[PDB]
């Protein structure tokens, strides 16, 4: 079968851990505070910057997600896994359905 | 090969909320501040009705000061409330999502299911993939 | 005995079947009128709340206070009813698209002996021999 061996991965948990360890949200604070700082002082320009933090946080969102997907794929191919279901979509899994979360995290680049 | 089922975890969260009394626990617990608030709101209603029929005077100018004092009493009260019910709502939610999970596991070991996927994540399931929702509600404790 | 699994990208089908159907221009259209009235109602309302802060107290001030209190309650009841009209109409057209797409998902599945179609959303990885049926499903949507 094309889907013989299945696995689950905890995307939300990898997102969180990889964010913490890269600092992205610190970085995104630093990116912006000066422009908040010099505004809580000071306004259609609080909407030109509200739509900058969106576009950027999202952008940082995506880069982390694509780095984690790469990782899922390397671990799934390296262990001959055919499908990696997202954990948040799974209410139960047997041992025949391994959780690869920690293996995946270890490969994130 | 892996045997697979689905569970509707939205159509089940409300069924187990009723079944377990939690839905009504939360009800009983909040009805006091919810009566405090209704009372407070029609008191207002009727004061503002009064203000639509009062002449330029200082009686009216005053009922205006008191009704703009009541309007902030009913707003520190209405989101001390909305926040405390969303936050007990979360706890009651989190606590019984695990009742449900526990029931899902028992049902999956009963029926030899290796993977139970959430319904909202599936677009189609054949008759080889069982919807175990009703079986799960039966097992919830 | 192994169940045959495929994946379908619902968010893509939805946003493609939504375009082709014009539901979104149809909802903007259905509501831009009332949106505009409510906007104009708001800024004319602002103009009054401005001139009230401006006046010396007496006959005209209370007349203005009573005009505003009454417009505020008409506005609030109208914004409310526009929200529940938007929410519900969006809700319905959402459903209509869902149903039409699911019927397509069902026929392609039956036609290819598929047992479980997972939404791509929920899949972090799949081998290339587990089929993405988004395109076949799109072609069959009526």
Curated annotation (Swiss-Prot), chain A:
GO CC field: cytosol; outer membrane-bounded periplasmic space
Swiss-Prot/TrEMBL keywords: Chaperone, Periplasm, Signal
Any GO MF annotation of the entry: unfolded protein binding
Keyword Nuclease: no
TM region positions: none
Domain of life according to the entry: Bacteria
Residue span of region Lipopolysaccharide binding: 45-56
UniProt KW Aminoacyl-tRNA synthetase keyword: no
Annotated localization: Periplasm
BP GO terms, sorted: chaperone-mediated protein folding; Gram-negative-bacterium-type cell outer membrane assembly; protein folding; protein insertion into membrane from inner side; protein maturation; protein stabilization
InterPro entries: Chaperone_Skp (IPR005632), Skp_dom_sf (IPR024930)
Other facts noted in the record for this chain: Does not require ATP for its activity.
Function: Molecular chaperone that interacts specifically with outer membrane proteins, thus maintaining the solubility of early folding intermediates during passage through the periplasm. Required for the efficient release of OmpA from the inner membrane, the maintenance of its solubility in the periplasm, and, in association with lipopolysaccharide (LPS), for the efficient folding and insertion of OmpA into the outer membrane.
Subunit-level organization: Homotrimer. Interacts with OmpA. Interacts with PhoE during its translocation across the inner membrane, but, in contrast to OmpA, release of PhoE from the inner membrane is not dependent on skp. Also interacts with LamB, OmpC and OmpF.
Family: Belongs to the Skp family.
Domain notes per entry: Composed of a compact central beta-barrel domain with long alpha-helical extensions that form a three-pronged structure around an internal cavity. Substrate proteins may be bound in this cavity.
NCBIfam families noted in UniProt: PRK10780.1 (NF008047)
Protein name per the record: Chaperone protein Skp
Taxonomic source organism: Escherichia coli (strain K12)
């Amino acid at each position: 079968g094309a889907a013989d061996k299945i696995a689950i991965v905890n995307m939300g948990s990898l997102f969180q851990q990889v964010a913490q360890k890269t600092g992205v949200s610190n970085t995104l604070e630093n990116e912006f505070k000066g422009r908040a700082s010099e505004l809580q002082r000071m306004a259609q320009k609080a909407q030109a910057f509200e739509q900058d933090r969106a576009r950027r946080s999202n952008e940082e969102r995506g880069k982390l997600v694509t780095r984690i997907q790469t990782a899922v794929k390397s671990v799934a191919n390296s262990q001959d896994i055919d499908l990696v279901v997202d954990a948040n979509a799974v209410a139960y899994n047997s041992s025949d359905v391994k959780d690869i979360t920690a293996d995946v995290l270890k490969q994130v680049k």
